[PDB]
Each structure stands twice: as structure tokens, then as C-alpha cells.
Design a protein around this ligand. Structure first.
Ligand SMILES: Nc1ncnc2c1ncn2[C@@H]1O[C@H](COP(=O)(O)OP(=O)(O)O)[C@@H](O)[C@H]1O
Ligand SMILES: Nc1ncnc2c1ncn2[C@@H]1O[C@H](COP(=O)(O)OP(=O)(O)O)[C@@H](O)[C@H]1O
Ligand SMILES: Nc1ncnc2c1ncn2[C@@H]1O[C@H](COP(=O)(O)OP(=O)(O)O)[C@@H](O)[C@H]1O
Ligand code: BEF
Ligand code: BEF
Ligand code: BEF
Ligand SMILES: [Mg+2]
Ligand SMILES: [Mg+2]
Ligand SMILES: [Mg+2]
Ligand SMILES: [Zn+2]
Ligand SMILES: [Zn+2]
Ligand SMILES: [Zn+2]
Ligand SMILES: [Zn+2]
Lengths: 374, 337, 343, 371, 366
DNA sequence: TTTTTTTTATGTACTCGTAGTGTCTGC
DNA sequence: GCAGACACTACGAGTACATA
């Protein structure tokens, strides 16, 4: 708040203690138990998708390893070591950006200095970021180092796709996996962020931001920063909706209903309104397809619908119980063929209109009238 | 067409572009769209000869200057050419990168600099994208010349950069007269060759000059034998060759004329072969003709596009699938809906 | 220019060393045994200095200068060993061998090994320059028809009692890998000091370390042996051979099969094979293949092959090693194949 | 000589301030708000179609970031830093054509040199255009810097295809999407340019140029230069209509009428006549698709048909009256797949012939003569 | 620090006598008999999959060859040579991490010591680990050394891929191939290790840990340590089951099993989990298509199982037997259509869900 | 018994031979 | 001086491997 330096939310709000990490209860509990009880393994591999915390948790473990109060599961913020780690100036936290130092010569250099003891630290940490980037010779140079490391050196690896690492490396190092974050967790974290930082916000905009960056919190933080930029320094529903290009679920389902009940004039009116609003036509097709898929899923089971669409939940049910699944299959196929063939239509508006007209003509119940003359 | 023959059907456009280049109102990156053998190479050569040396009278060649001596001998270092390695078939991005950096290192002789890509359709994605900034912001008095047979095949990000010029095919009667003067063959054969090459007199001249006419007549005889018996496999003996895509295009043209005859179109494309089109119309159903045409076009495209694909296997598979289709009670394919 | 088999090598070795010995073939074990025997008899004849050079486009070529003809300072007779590349010599290697042969003398014995030379290279100038001076040794892997006899012979060499079932198991597991077979015989001699060999453990001290070639796979397809074909495909996939070579090797024979089947309705296969120049080893195999298969099965095979080729050279996918498998089952003792799975 | 070389409109008319943008207001508002406040970021990724403005937007962002007046939402051309950024030769603005240098060695050298302090500039701006062509090794090399860069470093990336970029790189930057320009905006920009250049123009020619630009302003400028070169120094309706091969008569309408009537002889005669005059085939298919769209709309709503095609209204009314919607949909689908198939079988004439034959195949062509 | 001292289960429990190596009976027996009869080959090359004891058995060989009590299959721990083998500081044992010393310079420097007699051992023993990666010229030097090896030097090469080794070295080395450890042996030694330490355990949990590791003992022990860390000091069935669910990777097989049984809730949960475990949807659908192809092929001939499905054979056999070929063909066609249709759909998770729903709709399950 | 057999474009490492560059040592 | 030696570092070439 008071910091005139508008630090990026992706950087300012990096986790400080294990209490500041949202989600990933598996890895958090595992590390807390393996650091309170002891038995610290000599190699870790955090495998997960983008922007889930593959590096910050490694830094938290580094803080928890060599702290002035001993090996602790609660990284303090008072002693010099933890603050030096956070500032990135710490002596023993050797942050090996494996993307740059990927050649086997650099790995040999790293292994040469492994035995030279730590300075002002219980352990020396070799935090190798993006290990899946090293060359094959670099991968294999550190085998006997990983299997029998010195008592004061601990590796902490962090990769996006562990499948590209050789199988023996997956054997040697612990394999911790970080699941993608859920929508509710992202929304709660963003509410925390926009409450700590004095920025007014609206819950619907926060839900939209959380859904638009599914599975990755850094994506959500970047989108929230860009929405703050797009808005007048506040996260409002209108600003987020206009920025994302998404169309509000209520109005897309209104178009879907107008298509299902064979009301051509309502379809045309809603199309004209969307054209006036400037929403991308392909985005409109995407939203209609997503809603049709959600209808199919709620036909599969009523539990398939979460609170995310709660605003129109009733309408959703009123579409699930009134039409057979075969109609949904036909509608999805027609709209998807339309999306596939859109880029070659005379215009995107022309293509979307023609696709909707085709879905209207070919739909089974109360189809369009045919010419009176045979 | 051995090398760079001046073409009368090129004379108008030429002077027009000179009128644009002489007045300093010409785009740096000009994309030529012309048929294969239309003469775009000669147009680019004449333009480069005008550009790269001391200003001549204002038209024709550049006279007897150092520029002409270096250009005719192919020694001018300000005349960069992009041609695929004969061992390869595509413009490696390394060649384009080297040319662009050499262009960035300023000219060697007096005057402007000219970069000419011998064919835009042969650019790979990396090679095509390595030219984007250079086309957008040429260093200083740098003029590009890209030749292609269809701008749509080229990347959209490159078609934006270049001002597009169109070399329209000459009127069919004039091209027929020109070819009859150049080559002594009957009118029907001449017309069929011209329509086969989409009205490109240079391509028809190339077809006549080589053995392509003998290959076409051999394919015609093989088709005449195979159509009534239903033994299309023998056509393999005439279809497998380094020029397989062209012969597949000829086969597709024959099938198109067969469907035309079924619909009784007033215009055809294989004028000098009425017997084959009559036999194809008689012995084959229109749906079968359409299916065979689609399969042949698909196989030709697959042969031409995917580099390194085995010709023999594809041609044999096409012939066997056609054999299967000719048998009664076999479901024909439809275009991917 | 003498020609010999490894079994006869001692006969030439105990008679007297020639100017040079050429060890041509593709068996690591046979070539290694021949080279070791030549080196041993040379040491018995008083050859002490051994220098090994690998023929490579970038390797050292100091071997020419190594023929100093002045070893007399110590006067230790030299033996020179050359390792030819996988594809054999090239032109540059040709003149290198010319100038090496031109400097040959009595004090030096030359040992040359590598893959068997083709007819185009068997008339090379250096090889001719070794006429009346060289002993070629033929080391080619015995096929499964001849392999069990060789296994029994080597078992008798080690004075081990080999059972027929054990011989069959070892032949099946170690096909195309003679060195592995020798190692297995040594290992089973160490495991059982009694000397007998029976099923309960020879089926235990063995692995599927067989090495195959695409020709073996195509032969298995022609003979319609599904199990052997699938095992060969798995071994080739594990070895890492490129799928394109498999595609071409099968394409040649499949196209020949299609043409022969088409022509069989009008001409006896005996004349058709001779017209197409089919060797006596493969005439009967292709005859049985033609008698087993119908035109429909061959058409399905070529359709599957085309789809595999397209998905290999266009999508760059790794599904090829699966599709080939189906193609295997498509052509062996009632394929009973499908359409959606291939078409 | 003010133009030593032809400063083509695609280069002379590059925007210099934020007020010269043709209407990318959704991203401009965010940029202006960020620069006005302290909210500044270290990684901007502008994406969208070709010739839409993202390189110009990035250059304007650099000008605003480095001008000595301050961090201004509107950069000042008087500033020396702006004077040098608008041209080349700026010690801070490092522009790298990513496709030109895709090798990981160049990216590694750049990331080695990023450590040094900027020279006389507030921020060392790295503008990497065409970023989607970088080798995956360079992509992974650009991860740890973009996440915690030095304060004095700002990264500006531009690409025409966000999908080709790894998701990790997208996850660290502000993704701005530049919508394709509508017809009206392109026409207004073109009329403003041509009025500023003292070159005569006609409204119909400008409308045709905007329509054929396909939403890209660089395409519009290139087409305008085509018209200038082939229009004797003026943008005239006749010149642009001739160069584009556009249709002024009812050739497309007569062709589709013959096709829906299943008169193959008439269809092929009309296509031969079209080949005689050299009408561009892609435009013909686009016009046919548009006419079929209008047919479907009038079948759904006759009022909608009331449009520019008033002089031919009766024909489309009759076609809508006599043709079922399913047949129109099948025709549109066939013609659309055919349009997808034009850059196949390089002789495009027989490509359109294939498409027309496929369209004709649906209705019965039986020799059975009946009224 | 203030946590007493707890080593790593992978490095600890490494065998120190030939009787402590579990499995690989043939290699140990052959080595024992060879050392008993005095028949020792010049070079021993070990090979096999990861974590089956190649390095450990080679280290045991090096300890045995220089034991003062004599060359034996069971070297004592008494000998100071044996103790120095334990500590890793033995003058006569030369451990060369060939994965690090690949260059010909270092290899030649370390191979020029063959001329020097052993300091305190009968044989100068080289343990060249990870021999597969080694420069070509280093292979030339090693071959030249092995061709005329001194009688007081024995080589102990170890590797994971023996194919990369040149044939000239293979033909001179007695090669011992080590099998992937059987599940029962892995479970037995895991039980014994957990009992020797003061760690409680459960039978089903132990079986799950054994099955999770793909026949490699190091994998089993690493997962054991990770589960103990996650299990709050106890190897409990629920905790390890949840851990392995988080680390579960073969999603496609479970997706196929749920799809063929028309279990909508199960397939929805599985795809939700596969979404949480961030992956590529195209890759998942390609894997599903390939598994269906394999199931269709196996029904025609069992030999289609091959070697890749060694850890998957049990479920695939049941799937092939219990499902008619027509249903498999229909599922393959549906999934192929879905994969062709996937990129144009909404976000690929939606497309995969829709394709799975399309496949599920065929069965009459309600 | 004998020969038979390959898809490129672009990029990234790895390792050895040869040369170019510094510098400094008793020569 | 000092130039050769010796180190040291860089560059080409041949080879192996990855991704699309
Ligand atoms: N579990 C999490 N809890 C809180 N913030 C997170 C979490 N994961 C990611 N973030 C946000 O993302 C930023 C960078 O996260 P990082 O840990 O680098 O992800 P990665 O695993 O890709 O390296 C953090 O500063 C934080 O704001
Ligand atoms: N928003 C805009 N305002 C004004 N001119 C524009 C705009 N966008 C594009 N242009 C025109 O297009 C030309 C190229 O623009 P550029 O910014 O390079 O597009 P890109 O995003 O594809 O790199 C400019 O020289 C300018 O004439
Ligand atoms: N046969 C075995 N018996 C007992 N433990 C084994 C065996 N194989 C592997 N291990 C376990 O794995 C750990 C590492 O084994 P190691 O022999 O180094 O494998 P590698 O073959 O990859 O070098 C050993 O500490 C031991 O715990
Ligand atoms: F940004 Be994370 F390390 F992928
Ligand atoms: F032409 Be722009 F950079 F997309
Ligand atoms: F140490 Be083993 F080769 F993984
Ligand atoms: Mg990270
Ligand atoms: Mg740009
Ligand atoms: Mg090991
Ligand atoms: Zn602390
Ligand atoms: Zn001149
Ligand atoms: Zn300023
Ligand atoms: Zn002892």
C-alpha cells in the first residue's frame, strides 16, 4: 500500500513463510513434517505446471534448512540468513539457473566446488531452477554426486515436466508433485491481495479473474495487475469483462436459449447487441460451446456444475431436463464446425451468423419451415 | 525456357514498375505473383539491371558500365540471390540470415542494394520469418524482389510487408499464336497445353521443349488401355517419375474434362484427346469420377507438400484405392465436411 | 589370395603368417576370435609391438609414417590393426589403403577388419594390391537353421553337456548376437561346475538381448510367423533402429508381392520369379507368401503402410512402432484384422 | 531530397505519440493508466494479427518510459531520448529480431549483458519482436530473468501467435490483445493519411481498400501503395476495382442461380466467361458465400435482405422462396471448404471448378428432362 | 543441527556382503564360483536398469578382490582394506566417475597408472562408473589398455545402457546383465528394512510402495523415504495411497478402464485429477488412443504384449479378454474423431471431457 | 548364401585438432 | 630484450541427439 514503488504483485507477494502458501497442502505438510522430525533428503524435485510455486517453495525450504534458530519448519523473518535468502544475496543459496548454465562444463564446475564447505550456514543449497533444461551429459555428470553427496550440500530441483529428465535422476531425487491451484483458492488469494493492497474490488470480477487463469496463480496475479491497469486502479466487473474479451454467462446462455427454442429474431438481436459491444465473434462462439459442454456435463451428473455458474444455475437445470443429449451433440458439432470454418467465411460476423443459422435450420425440434413449393 | 527470355506479355507491367521505381515511388519489398515460367525471373533480372548500376537513359538496359559487366558475369556483390541448395529443395534459414546480415553491413560498390529471392513459395517458416524485420525496415536504399505462384501459400505476416504485383496471363488467342509461331504443333494440342498450364505460355513452352509431351502421350495411351478393362495399376508405369505431381495434375485435368463431358460443358481442357474423355464419360459414373478426382488431387498435394515422402508407395496406394472404387458396391469418399 | 573360415584359421596360422590378414564379416565374436588368434600366433612368431588404428574421416593417418622400417633400435616386430567403418571404406580411405599397402614389408603384419565389402569395393585397387598376399576370413552369422549346430559345437568346445531344449532357448533368446551366446555359455559354465546344461536355469540366466535386422523382420512377415515378427519388431524398437528403414525394407517386398500376385493369374510363379530375379533362398518363401495371401489382404497392407508413412513424415508422431505391429498381424496365418484400427 | 528512398506509408506514417493510434483504446487506456500512476511492469507481451500496431505500441511505450520529461503517458518528441528512439541509435533500447537470432547463444549473451546499468536512461528496454520464433532453449533461458529482472530492465515482447510461445513465458507477462481494426477505423485512418499527403481519393476506393485489408492496417497501406503505383498518382475507384478484380455485375449472383438450378451447362459457361475476363476466383467465392449468407438471412427474416443489393432483391427473394434452408447450408459449406482449398492444386481455376462440381453434386443432375 | 542425525535410506542399507544383495542371484553365484575357482576375467562389465545394484555389486567385487583374507565371495569387514573400501578412501580402488571424467585427457591420466604396482592390494581395481558416456578417444585409450592389461589390474565397468558402449569393448569384457527386481523381493526387503529401523508399517501400504516402484530398488527406497516424510513418521496405508495418487501418472489407463465400464463419476474424477496434475491434453488423448490400439491388437494375438507392458500386462489382458472387438473399434473411432476435433474446441480440458462423454454415451448405462 | 535396404529443417551439445593470443622465464 | 614455451582460450569439424 504505502510503497510508492508499485512492485509487481507477482514479485511483491512472494510467500515468506509456510503459512503464506495457498494450496499445495501435500508438499507443505510433507516438508513441515520432514523438517520438524528431521531426516532431510539430499535432493528435491518439485514437478508441477506453470505458476503454481515451483520455485518459491524451494526458497522457503532453503530458508527452513539453514536458519539461525536451527532446522525449523517455521522460517523466521528476523535472522540475517532468512532475509538474505529473500533478497537473493545469500552466500550459500547458489541459485543455478540451469537454462543458462546448461553445458556439461558448467555442471563439472558446479560439482568441483561441492566439497568446499558452507560459509555462515548449516547447509549449502544448490537450487537448480528448470533442471529439465540441462544437456544429457550435464544430467549424467551429477549422478554419483546426487547418490552420495557431501553431508553439507543439499540439491533442490524444480522442473515443469519431469518426464524429460532421465529415469535415474527421477530415482535419486525425491519426487514432490504440486497440483494446479483450484479456482476458489485463487479467488481467496486475490481477495487477500486486493485487501492488503488498498484497491477497491468487486467479487464477480475476482471470480472472473480466478477462472480466466485456471490452475496457475501467477497467471491470476498478472491478469489482476493488467486489470488494475485497464481499470481506474480498481478491479471492477466491467473492466475485467471488457479486458478478458469474455462474455457474461447470463447473456451467452440467453443466446443459447434463443437458438434452442428456434427464435431467430432473438438470436439476431443478441448478435447485433454483441456486435455493438465489440465482443470478438470467436469469443462468442467459444462461450456458447463452453455452455453447451456444461449442459452435457450436467446431463452426465447434476454435481458437474459448481458455484461458478451459480448466477444462472437454475437456467442451466432448465436446459438439462428439457432436451435430449443427442440435441446437445448436434448443437456442439454444428457450432464447432462453424468455429473451425470461421476464418474462411466472408466475415467473422458473417461466419458466426451463418453457423447460428445452420444450427437453427438443422436442429430437430420445431425446425425452420421449408418452401411451400416442393 | 532455358534462361531469362524476354517476354512481350511482360513489357507493359515492366515499364509501369520502372515508372514507379524511377520516380522514387516504388515499394522496397515487391512480391511478384506469376505463373511458373510466366517470366517473372526475366522481369526481376531487368529490374535489378536497371537498379544496381549507373542510371541509363531511363529505360532498356544499363548500357556498358561496370554494373552491367559485373551483373552479366554474375559477380556483382550488391546483387544477392536466394536459391535453394541443389542437394536440398528449400531455402535454409541460414542462407537468409547470412544475406540479411551482409545487407546490414552496407553496400560495397556505389548505388543501391538488391536482394532477390528466386521463389517465395520455397521459403520455410523459419526462413520466411527471418525476413520480417528486414522487409519492414530495409537499411538504406534496399529493394527486395520475391517471386511466387500464389500469395496465399506464403505467410500472412510476409504478404503484409510486400506491395503485391500481378502478372496476368496473356489472352489465350495471343498466347496460342505466339506458341504456334514458336512451336510447330496442331491447334488442338496447343490449346490443351495452354489450358493445362493455366494459360502460362512459358510453362507450355517448357512442357513442349522437354520429354513432358512424350510422358503425357504415354499416360494417355495407358489411360486408354486401363479405362475399359479396369486395370488402373498399369498406370503406375507412367506415373512414377520425378515429375509425378505434374502428371497427377494432368490426370486430374483428364478427370475434370470427363466430368465436364458428363455435364456437357461447352468448354473443356483436353481438347486434342476426345477419345479418352468420351471413354471416361461412358465407362465411369459421375460420382466415381468425382471421387477419383478428389483422391488424385489429394495424393498430388501430399506428394508436393510433404518433403521426403515416398512417391512409389503413395502412387501404388492411389492406384489400388482407385481399383477398389471401380468395383461395384464400394462406398465412395466425400469431401471432409 | 586365400579364403578361409574361422575354424580353419589355425591351419593357416600354424603354417606361417602371410603378408596380411583381412577379417571381413559382421560377427563381433568371430572377428574378435580370429584377430586374437592371429595376434597370439604372431606373438609366438615374435611380434611384440601392436598398434590399433580406427579408420575414420577424422582419424589420425600417422600409420603411413609409422612404417619407419627402423624399429631395429629395439627390433620388436610390429603388428598393425585397422578397423573399417560401418559402411566400409570410401575413396579417401581407398587411396589411404593404397599407400599403406605400398609400404608393406616382411617385418610388419597387417590385420584389417570391418563389415563385409561389397562387390563394388571388392575390386578396389588396394584389395587387388593384396592379391597372393592376403587371407580373407569369412565371419557371417549362422542363421537359425545353422545356429543350433554352432551352439552345440561351442558347447562341446567348453566340454559342457547341452540339452536340446537349452540349445533352442539360447538360440531363441540370443539370435543374431554370437558374443552374447559365448558370454552365456561361459556364465552357465560358471554357474554350474558340473558341466551339464538343462532348462531349470538356462531359462533363468538369459535375457532378450537378441539383435535383428529389417531383413529378418521381412522374412518373418513372408513366412507368416506372427510371434517371431512381433518379437523382432520389439527388439528393433529397443535397439533404436529408425522406423523409415523398416518401412522401406517392407515396402520393397510388399510391392514385389503385389505385382507378383497380380501377374500370377496369367503366368506360373516359377517364370515370374525368374523374370523378377528372385534368389533361390527367397523363391520358395515368396511362393508360400503368395499362396497364403489374397489381393484384399495386400491392398489392406499397402493402405496401412501408406497411413504409417504419412503419420511418420507429416505428423512426426511416435505411433509408427504400434502401426507396424498391426501390419505384422495383417499378413500372418489368417490376420483377422480390422478397418478402423488401420484404414 | 526529403525521400532519399521511398519512405513508404507503412514506414513514414508510423505513430509517434499515443494520439496517433487508430483506436486500440482498450490497451491504450491500460498503458496510460499504468504510466500515469506508479504501476509499471517489467514484461509486456503484445499479441494479435499482422500489421495491427503492437510493434508501434511497444516503441511508443519505450518512448514514454525513457523520455527525460518523466514517466509520461504522452511522450514528448522534443525529448532527446524520443528523438533517438524514433530513429535508430539508442544505447538503451535494444531491439532484437527474435527470428533473426533464434540461437540460444545470442540470448545467453544478452542475459549476460543485462546485468550492466543503463546508460543515461531510466529503463533499459529490451524490445524482442517476433518472439515466437526463438528456439525452445532460448525460451527457457528467458524464464528466470523475466520473473525477477533488475529494476532498470523492462522487457517488451511482440508476437503474431501467442500459442507457439510456451505457457511459462505467457505466465510471466502482461498479455495485451490487439483486436483487428474494423472497416470504419481503417477507412478513417486512410482518409486522414491521404488528406495529409495531398493525394486525391474517392470514398468507394477507400471503402474497398478497408474491406480487402482483412482488419490489418499495414495491408491497407500496402494496398494504397498498390493503387498509387497503378493509379497514376491518385487513388481511384476504377484502378482499385481493376487491381482487386472485384465484381461490379451480377456474375456471382447468376452463377449461384445456375448452380442452385443445377444447370451444369450454364454454370460452366459462366465460369468460362469469368475465366475469359480474368476475374479473381477467391473474390468470386467470397461474394458467393456472402450472397448465400444473405439468402439464409432473408429466409429467416425477409426484412434483413433490404440492403445495398436492392436492384437484385427480386432474385434473392425468389431463391429464398424456392430453395430449402438445408440446401443453402450445404452449398455454403461446400463453397467454404472449397475456399479453404484454393491454395491447393496450384491451378486455382480447376480448384474453383472442383468446388462448383462438389456443390452441384448435391442436387440431382439426372438427364431426366422435367419442368 | 538440532535434529539428532538421520541419513538417507537410499545410501544407507547398501549391502556390505554378497548375502545382503537381494535378487540377481545368478550374477552373485557366478561371481562367487569364479572367485572360488580362481577363474577371473580381465574386465567385468555390469549392466542393467537403474537401481538394481550394479554399482553396489561392483563395489562389493572391489572390496572382495583386495581382501587380505583372500579373494572370496564373502569378504570380511575386519580387514583394514575392507574398512577403507567402506570409507571410500582406498589407494588400490580407483573410482572414476566416467560421467564426469569423459574427456580423453583425464581418462588417459588415470589409465597411465596401470604401470604402477598396487600399494596394499593384490589387484589394482578400476571402478569406472557410468561407462556408457565416454569420449571416442577415451574409448580408444581404454581399449588399448584392455588389449594388453597387466596381470595385477582388473576392470569393473558399470552402466545403464550397454548399447552405447562400442562393440570392441563389449567383446573384451565379461558382461553381467542384472534383471529388474521382482515385486516380491522388493516387498520382502522393504519389510526387512522397515523392521530393522524403528518405523511402523502396514502390509497393504508396503505392497503399494513395492508396486509403485518399477522394479528398481532405489525407486522403492526413495518412495519409502518420501512416504515416511509425508506419513508423519508412519507408513500408513491412507497416507501412502494419497501420496501415490498425487504422484500417479498413468492416467490414460484408468481413463480407459472407467470409459469401458461406463462409470461417469469415476471418469469425471479421473479427468479432474489429470487436470490438477498439470499435463498436456493432446498427449493424454494420444496415450488413450494408443492404449486402445494395443488392446485391439492383443485380442488378435497375445504376443502383442511385448516388453513395454511388463508392468501393465495384468490389466491389459483383462481388458482385451472382457471387451468385444467391435466396442474397442467404436471407442477408437470416437477417440480419433475427438483428437482430430480437439484443438478447435474450447479450452482443451472441455474438449477432452466432451470426447469422453461421447464415448460413454454408447453404452446403455444410465 | 548374397544383396537386399533413409525424412528432412533447425537447433543444441560434446569433444578433439589446430591456430591465435598473452606473458614471462630463465633464456 | 625475448622468443619459445607454455599456457590458455577460441574456433572448425566430426558426431550424437532433440523437436517439429
Ligand atoms: N502456492 C502459492 N501461494 C502463494 N503465492 C503463489 C503460490 N504459487 C505461486 N504464487 C505466486 O507466484 C509468484 C511466483 O511463484 P513461483 O513460486 O516462482 O512459481 P514457480 O513454481 O513457477 O517458480 C509468487 O510470488 C506468488 O505470488
Ligand atoms: N494503431 C495504429 N495507429 C496508426 N497506425 C497504425 C496502427 N497500427 C498499425 N498502424 C500502421 O501500420 C504500420 C505498421 O504498424 P506496426 O505497429 O509495425 O504493426 P505490428 O503490430 O504488426 O508490428 C505502421 O507504420 C502504421 O502505419
Ligand atoms: N540388489 C540390491 N540389493 C540391495 N539394495 C539395492 C540393490 N540394488 C539397488 N539397491 C539400493 O539402491 C541404492 C543405490 O544402489 P546402486 O547399486 O548405486 O544402483 P546403480 O546400479 O544405479 O548404481 C543402494 O543403496 C541400495 O539401497
Ligand atoms: F514460473 Be515457474 F518456476 F514455472
Ligand atoms: F506485423 Be505485426 F508485428 F504483427
Ligand atoms: F547408479 Be545407477 F546407475 F542409477
Ligand atoms: Mg520458477
Ligand atoms: Mg511488428
Ligand atoms: Mg551407479
Ligand atoms: Zn531465520
Ligand atoms: Zn548500367
Ligand atoms: Zn519525453
Ligand atoms: Zn577383509
Amino acid at each position: 500500500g504505502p510503497h510508492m514503488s508499485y512492485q509487481v504483485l507477482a514479485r511483491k507477494w512472494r510467500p515468506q513463510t509456510f503459512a503464506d502458501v495457498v494450496g499445495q497442502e501435500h508438499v507443505l505438510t510433507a516438508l513441515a513434517n520432514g523438517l520438524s522430525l528431521g531426516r532431510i533428503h539430499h535432493a528435491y524435485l518439485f514437478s508441477g505446471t506453470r505458476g503454481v510455486g515451483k520455485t518459491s517453495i524451494a526458497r522457503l525450504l532453503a530458508k527452513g534448512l539453514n536458519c539461525e534458530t536451527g532446522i525449523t519448519a517455521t522460517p523466521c523473518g528476523v535472522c540475517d540468513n532468512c532475509r538474505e535468502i529473500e533478497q537473493g544475496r545469500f552466500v550459500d543459496l547458489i541459485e543455478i539457473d540451469a537454462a543458462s548454465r546448461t553445458k556439461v562444463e558448467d555442471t563439472r564446475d558446479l560439482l568441483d566446488n561441492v566439497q568446499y564447505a558452507p560459509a555462515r550456514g548449516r547447509f549449502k543449497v544448490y537450487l537448480i531452477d528448470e533442471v529439465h533444461m540441462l544437456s544429457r551429459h550435464s544430467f549424467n555428470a551429477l549422478l554419483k554426486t546426487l547418490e552420495e553427496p557431501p553431508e553439507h550440500v543439499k540439491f533442490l530441483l524444480a522442473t515443469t515436466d519431469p518426464q524429460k529428465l532421465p529415469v535415474t535422476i527421477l530415482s535419486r531425487c525425491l519426487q514432490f508433485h504440486l497440483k494446479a491451484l483450484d479456482v476458489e483458492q485463487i479467488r481467496h488469494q486475490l481477495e487477500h491481495i486486493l485487501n492488503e493492497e488498498h484497491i477497491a474490488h468487486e467479487p464477480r470480477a475476482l471470480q472472473l479473474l480466478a477462472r480466466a487463469a485456471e490452475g496457475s496463480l501467477r497467471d491470476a496475479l498478472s491478469l489482476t495487475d493488467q486489470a488494475i491497469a485497464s481499470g481506474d486502479g480498481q478491479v471492477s466487473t466491467q473492466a475485467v469483462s471488457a479486458m478478458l474479451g469474455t462474455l457474461d454467462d447470463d447473456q451467452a446462455l440467453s443466446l443459447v436459449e434463443a437458438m434452442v427454442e428456434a427464435n431467430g429474431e432473438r438470436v439476431m438481436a443478441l448478435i447485433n447487441e454483441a456486435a455493438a459491444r465489440g465482443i470478438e465473434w470467436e469469443a462468442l462462439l467459444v462461450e456458447m460451446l463452453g455452455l453447451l459442454h456444461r449442459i452435457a456435463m450436467v446431463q452426465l451428473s447434476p454435481a458437474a456444475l459448481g458455484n461458478d455458474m451459480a448466477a444462472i444455475e437454475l437456467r442451466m437445470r432448465e436446459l438439462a431436463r428439457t432436451i435430449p443429449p443427442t440435441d446437445i451433440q448436434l448443437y456442439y458439432q454444428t457450432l464447432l464446425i462453424g468455429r473451425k470454418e470461421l476464418p474462411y467465411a466472408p466475415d467473422r460476423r458473417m461466419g458466426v451468423e451463418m453457423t447460428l443459422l445452420r444450427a437453427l435450420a438443422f436442429h430437430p425440434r420445431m425446425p425452420l419451415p421449408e418452401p411451400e413449393v416442393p | 525456357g532455358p534462361h531469362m527470355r524476354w517476354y512481350p506479355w511482360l513489357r507493359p507491367d515492366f515499364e509501369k514498375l520502372v515508372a514507379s521505381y524511377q520516380a522514387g515511388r516504388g515499394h522496397h519489398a515487391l512480391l511478384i505473383q506469376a505463373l511458373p515460367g510466366m517470366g517473372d525471373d526475366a522481369l526481376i533480372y531487368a529490374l535489378s539491371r536497371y537498379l544496381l548500376c549507373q542510371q541509363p537513359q531511363g529505360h532498356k538496359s544499363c548500357g556498358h558500365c561496370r554494373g552491367c559487366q559485373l551483373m552479366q558475369a554474375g559477380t556483382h556483390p550488391d546483387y544477392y540471390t536466394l536459391a535453394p541448395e541443389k542437394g536440398k529443395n528449400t531455402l535454409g534459414v541460414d542462407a537468409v540470415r547470412e544475406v540479411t546480415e551482409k545487407l546490414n553491413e552496407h553496400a560495397r560498390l556505389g548505388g543501391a542494394k538488391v536482394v532477390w529471392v528466386t521463389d517465395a513459395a520455397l521459403l520455410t517458416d523459419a526462413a520466411a520469418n527471418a525476413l520480417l524485420k528486414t522487409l519492414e525496415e530495409p537499411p538504406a536504399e534496399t529493394w527486395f524482389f520475391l517471386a511466387t505462384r500464389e500469395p496465399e501459400r506464403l505467410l500472412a505476416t510476409l504478404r503484409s510487408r510486400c506491395r503485391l504485383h500481378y502478372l496476368a496471363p496473356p489472352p489465350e488467342q495471343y498466347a496460342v499464336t505466339w506458341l504456334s509461331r514458336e512451336v510447330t504443333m496442331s491447334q488442338d494440342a496447343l490449346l490443351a497445353a495452354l489450358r493445362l498450364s493455366a494459360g502460362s505460355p512459358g510453362a507450355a513452352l517448357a512442357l513442349f521443349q522437354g520429354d513432358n509431351w512424350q510422358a503425357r502421350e504415354t499416360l494417355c495411351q495407358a489411360l486408354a488401355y486401363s479405362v475399359p478393362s479396369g486395370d488402373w495399376y498399369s498406370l503406375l508405369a507412367a506415373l512414377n517419375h520425378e515429375q509425378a505431381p505434374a502428371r497427377l495434375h494432368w490426370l486430374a485435368t483428364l478427370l475434370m474434362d470427363a466430368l465436364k463431358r458428363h455435364h456437357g460443358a461447352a468448354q473443356v481442357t483436353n481438347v486434342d484427346v476426345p477419345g479418352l474423355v468420351a471413354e471416361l464419360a461412358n465407362h465411369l459414373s459421375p460420382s466415381r469420377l468425382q471421387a477419383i478426382l478428389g483422391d488424385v488431387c489429394h495424393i498430388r498435394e501430399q506428394l508436393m507438400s510433404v518433403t521426403g515422402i515416398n512417391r512409389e508407395l503413395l502412387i501404388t496406394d492411389l492406384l489400388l484405392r482407385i481399383e477398389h472404387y471401380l468395383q461395384p458396391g464400394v462406398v465412395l469418399p466425400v469431401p471432409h465436411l | 589370395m586365400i579364403r578361409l573360415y574361422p575354424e580353419q584359421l589355425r591351419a593357416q596360422l600354424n603354417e606361417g603368417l602371410r603378408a596380411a590378414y583381412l577379417l571381413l564379416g559382421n560377427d563381433p565374436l568371430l572377428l574378435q576370435e580370429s584377430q586374437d588368434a592371429v595376434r597370439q600366433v604372431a606373438a609366438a612368431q615374435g611380434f611384440e609391438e601392436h598398434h590399433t588404428f580406427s579408420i575414420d574421416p577424422n582419424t589420425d593417418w600417422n600409420a603411413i609414417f609409422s612404417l619407419c622400417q627402423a624399429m631395429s633400435l629395439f627390433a620388436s616386430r610390429q603388428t598393425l590393426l585397422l578397423l573399417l567403418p560401418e559402411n566400409g571404406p570410401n575413396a579417401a580411405i581407398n587411396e589411404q589403403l593404397l599407400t599403406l599397402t605400398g609400404l608393406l614389408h616382411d617385418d610388419l603384419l597387417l590385420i584389417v577388419r570391418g563389415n563385409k565389402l561389397s562387390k563394388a569395393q571388392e575390386n578396389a585397387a588396394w584389395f587387388t594390391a593384396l592379391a597372393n598376399r592376403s587371407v580373407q576370413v569369412t565371419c557371417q552369422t549362422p542363421e537359425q537353421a545353422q545356429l543350433p549346430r554352432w551352439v552345440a559345437a561351442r558347447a562341446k568346445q567348453l566340454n559342457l553337456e547341452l540339452d536340446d531344449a537349452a540349445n533352442q532357448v539360447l538360440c531363441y533368446c540370443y539370435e543374431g548376437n554370437l558374443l552374447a551366446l559365448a558370454q552365456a555359455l561361459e556364465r552357465l559354465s560358471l554357474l554350474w561346475p558340473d558341466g551339464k546344461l538343462t532348462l531349470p536355469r538356462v531359462e533363468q540366466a538369459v535375457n532378450d538381448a537378441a539383435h535383428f535386422t529389417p531383413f529378418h523382420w521381412v522374412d518373418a512377415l513372408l513366412m507368416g510367423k506372427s510371434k517371431r515378427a512381433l518379437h523382432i519388431l520389439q527388439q528393433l524398437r529397443l535397439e533404436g533402429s529408425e522406423p523409415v528403414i523398416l518401412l522401406r525394407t517392407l515396402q520393397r517386398e510388399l510391392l514385389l508381392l503385389v505385382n507378383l500376385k497380380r501377374q500370377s493369374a496369367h503366368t506360373p510363379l516359377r517364370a515370374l520369379f525368374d523374370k523378377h530375379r528372385v534368389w533361390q533362398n527367397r523363391r520358395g518363401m515368396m511362393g508360400e507368401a503368395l499362396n497364403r495371401l489374397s489381393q484384399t489382404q495386400l491392398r489392406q497392407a499397402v493402405q496401412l503402410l501408406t497411413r504409417t508413412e504419412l503419420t511418420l513424415k507429416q505428423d512426426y508422431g511416435q505411433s509408427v512402432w504400434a502401426e507396424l505391429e498391426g501390419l505384422s498381424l495383417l499378413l500372418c496365418h489368417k490376420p483377422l484384422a480390422d478397418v478402423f484400427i488401420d484404414g
